[PDB]
């Protein structure tokens, strides 16, 4: 069992509502805040559907472009990381948030950070 | 010869004025623009003083805190990379620019990018 499908939470207040398909697809909705249509966005990505058996995590990644019917931040985040199973399962990620800029401002286009997602709220 | 000591230039209009000591020390001045005292900052770092002889580059890194007697951006950049020798010598880097933030704003504290340095202005 992949263990990925379901609702996941991070410490920024965001919710990662994901379905892991048999063919390696990640699909679902990313919420930047709870209880607001304007804070809901499409996500898509990919995961390793046949991970190693040696205790290693499951590699995965996904993207959100920060545009919906109500908002457009002219930006996109990618999360790259691994799912770690067990009684305290988590998704550990590093991420790149790129905003559209002019060519002279490209040096300031991309934020980097990290987020751990949990099956219980922080 | 290490080949690092001297003046280097990047595509952002900055100048890296560095001395590589026999002991592994990098010291000197970083200029964010030319001909302005307000744009000159101290740098310090380290380099591999006994690199491999198999065609590999020379690992190195340095830090600038963006404070001088004229300006303080409450920020620091680190460049991590390698020196590549030859007739078209280069220092190829990736970098992290962190600004001081509150804990709630820490997600937007760090910019990431890349810069190549050359011995001739681009």
């Amino acid at each position: 069992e992949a263990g990925i499908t379901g609702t996941w939470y991070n410490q920024l207040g965001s919710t990662f509502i994901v379905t892991a398909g048999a063919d390696g697809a990640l699909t679902g909705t990313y919420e930047s805040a709870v209880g607001n249509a304007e804070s809901r966005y499409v996500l898509t990505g990919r995961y390793d559907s046949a991970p190693a058996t040696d205790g290693s995590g499951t590699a995965l990644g996904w993207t959100v472009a920060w545009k919906n019917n109500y908002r457009n931040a002219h930006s996109a985040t990618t999360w790259s990381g691994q799912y770690v199973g067990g009684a305290e399962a988590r998704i550990n990620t590093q991420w790149l948030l790129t905003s559209g800029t002019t060519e002279a401002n490209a040096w300031k286009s991309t934020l980097v950070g990290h987020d751990t997602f949990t099956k219980v709220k922080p | 010869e290490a080949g690092i000591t001297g003046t280097w230039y990047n595509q952002l209009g900055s100048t890296f004025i560095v001395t590589a000591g026999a002991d592994g020390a990098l010291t000197g001045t970083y200029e964010s623009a030319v001909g302005n005292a307000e744009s000159r900052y101290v740098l310090t770092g380290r380099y591999d003083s006994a690199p491999a002889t198999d065609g590999s580059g020379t690992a190195l890194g340095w830090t600038v805190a963006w404070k001088n007697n004229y300006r303080n951006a409450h920020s620091a950049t680190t460049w991590s990379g390698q020196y590549v020798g030859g007739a078209e010598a280069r220092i190829n880097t990736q970098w992290l620019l962190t600004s001081g933030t509150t804990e709630a704003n820490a997600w937007k504290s760090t910019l990431v990018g890349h810069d190549t340095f050359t011995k001739v202005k681009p």
Binding site: S32, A33, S39, N72, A73 | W107, K108
Partner: peptide, 12 residues
């Protein structure tokens, strides 16, 4: 609300 969502909201 939260800081990240506030940033997104400020872009409109």
């Amino acid at each position: 609300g939260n800081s990240f969502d506030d940033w997104l909201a400020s872009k409109g």
